[PDB]
């Protein structure tokens, strides 16, 4: 059963100013899911603190980038918090209708779209370089989910049919035919670097076959 909803009308208005305005730096796309993994993977740590039976569904916290040049696919895993239905029908647990108004007013006093994070609507970044993004989560309090959207104004949410992971997110993007850099090594390494040097868990870069 695949339940098909509209974004509200704030976030479709984000989307589409993601995906239509030109803007050439679109490597920000890769801080802004690993720092939203670094986020999930603090709020399990802090949980985990004064209930240790919240890490028996994984204890290792890690976080590891997944590209696969068959498919066209760059996944950013993490073994955080993960979402639970609720959650993921609600902007995927961010403020989203309040952080795009803040962000939307903040652009026309001279911000640009590299501070979307600021605004905790980061993951939409992804839409910079994915045509399509699907999120597979699973919480310690629900089911396995994936959430899938190629924008257009809506996304789905069914249970999902694929591989129990334990616990935690999988942010798949299934990128653009000219962002293909994205799943070259040397890429990846250079925007982990310049970014995201310096964090609180383990960056595991797969390499292929
Ligand atoms: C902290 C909520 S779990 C989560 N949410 C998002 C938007 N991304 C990730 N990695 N994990
Ligand atoms: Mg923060």
Redesign the pocket.
């Known amino acids: 059963e695949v339940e098909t909803f509209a974004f509200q009308a704030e976030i479709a208005q984000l989307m589409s100013l993601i995906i239509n305005t030109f803007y050439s730096n679109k490597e920000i796309f890769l801080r802004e899911?690993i720092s939203?993994?670094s986020?999930?993977l603090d709020?399990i740590r802090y949980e985990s603190l004064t209930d240790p039976s919240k890490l028996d569904s994984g204890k290792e916290l890690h976080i590891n980038l997944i590209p696969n040049k068959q498919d066209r696919t760059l996944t950013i895993v993490?073994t955080?918090?993960?979402?639970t239905k609720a959650?993921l029908i609600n902007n995927?647990?961010?403020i989203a209708k309040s952080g795009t108004k803040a962000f939307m007013e903040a652009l026309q006093a001279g911000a640009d779209i590299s501070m979307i994070g600021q605004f905790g609507v980061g993951?939409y970044s992804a839409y910079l370089v994915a045509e399509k993004v699907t999120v597979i989560?699973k919480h310690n309090d629900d089911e396995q989910y994936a959430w899938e959207s190629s924008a257009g104004g809506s996304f789905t949410v069914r249970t999902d049919t694929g591989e129990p992971m334990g616990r935690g997110?999988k942010?798949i993007l299934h990128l653009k035919e000219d962002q293909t850099e994205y799943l070259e090594e040397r890429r990846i390494k250079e925007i982990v670097k310049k970014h995201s040097q310096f964090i609180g868990y383990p960056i595991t870069l797969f390499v292929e076959k």
């Open positions: 899911l939203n993994s986020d999930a709020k993490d955080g918090i993960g979402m959650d995927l647990g961010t993951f989560t997110t942010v």
